[PDB]
């Protein structure tokens, strides 16, 4: 008797996948990033994501080595699309990142807030009252989460 | 009709808490994403909700560890979902 988000829709909804791998440009232009290494392996995530959400009846929409500029552009498109016949929207972002931000393949910064706020109720009425999911895989700093000992679960 | 807040129905799934690093294995993907998909594939079929799934991800990624830099990873979902989000198969 718990309320549930409807999920029947023919294609369910789009599932973007900004997959950033080659950060060479970012190395060139941004000094504080003279060493960000390329994200070797993303491919496997992208693949897994595609397969998984494809199996869940979502229309995958990959994009590779996008710059901040390009990312915003891509979201703008989906922000303006008409999702009326869609039950859900998903956006996955695989890239480097820092506190609250996502790094563009060119080294530029994109606040995660700027990204998700693109799909509010006003910003995109076609999605109003529909789950808008964002999976962000990136660093949020250079610190290492330390481990603590405990008892088995 | 009726009204709901502008920022309702969102689900943000971060791979790591703020200020920390997340791990990517060149040979098999990121701890987070891989786990996410693994969990998704065996859970959704069973009709499990996304928050449940995300919790399992939290469990799993917690047991993982980068021995070298003696480090770990803590995923952190945040949400304004007003219903259970389930992905039927």
């Amino acid at each position: 008797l718990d309320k549930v988000y409807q999920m029947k829709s023919k294609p369910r909804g789009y599932c973007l996948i900004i997959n950033n791998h080659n950060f060479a440009k970012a190395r060139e232009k941004v000094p504080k990033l003279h060493s960000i290494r390329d994200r070797n392996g993303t491919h496997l995530d992208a693949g897994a994501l595609t397969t998984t959400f494809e199996e869940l009846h979502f229309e995958i929409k990959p994009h590779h080595d996008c710059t901040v500029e390009q990312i915003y552009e891509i979201l703008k498109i989906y922000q303006l699309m008409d999702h009326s016949n869609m039950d859900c929207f998903i956006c996955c972002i695989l890239s480097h990142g820092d506190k609250g931000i996502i790094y563009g393949t060119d080294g530029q910064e994109a606040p995660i807030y700027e990204l998700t706020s693109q799909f509010t109720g006003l910003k995109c009425p076609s999605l109003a009252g529909k789950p808008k999911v964002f999976f962000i895989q990136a660093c949020q700093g250079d610190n290492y989460q330390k481990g603590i000992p405990v008892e088995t679960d | 009709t009726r009204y709901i807040p502008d920022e309702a129905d969102f689900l943000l799934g971060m791979a790591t808490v703020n200020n920390c690093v997340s791990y990517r294995n060149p040979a098999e993907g990121t701890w987070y994403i891989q786990s996410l998909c693994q969990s998704l594939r065996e859970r959704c079929p069973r009709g499990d909700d996304i928050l449940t799934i995300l919790t399992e991800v939290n469990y799993e990624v917690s047991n993982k560890d980068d021995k070298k830099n003696m480090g770990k990873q803590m995923p952190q979902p945040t949400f304004t979902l007003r219903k259970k989000l389930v992905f039927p198969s």
Binding site: S95 | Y23, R24, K68
Partner: peptide, 4 residues
């Protein structure tokens, strides 16, 4: 084992 690589950081993002």
């Amino acid at each position: 084992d690589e950081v993002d």
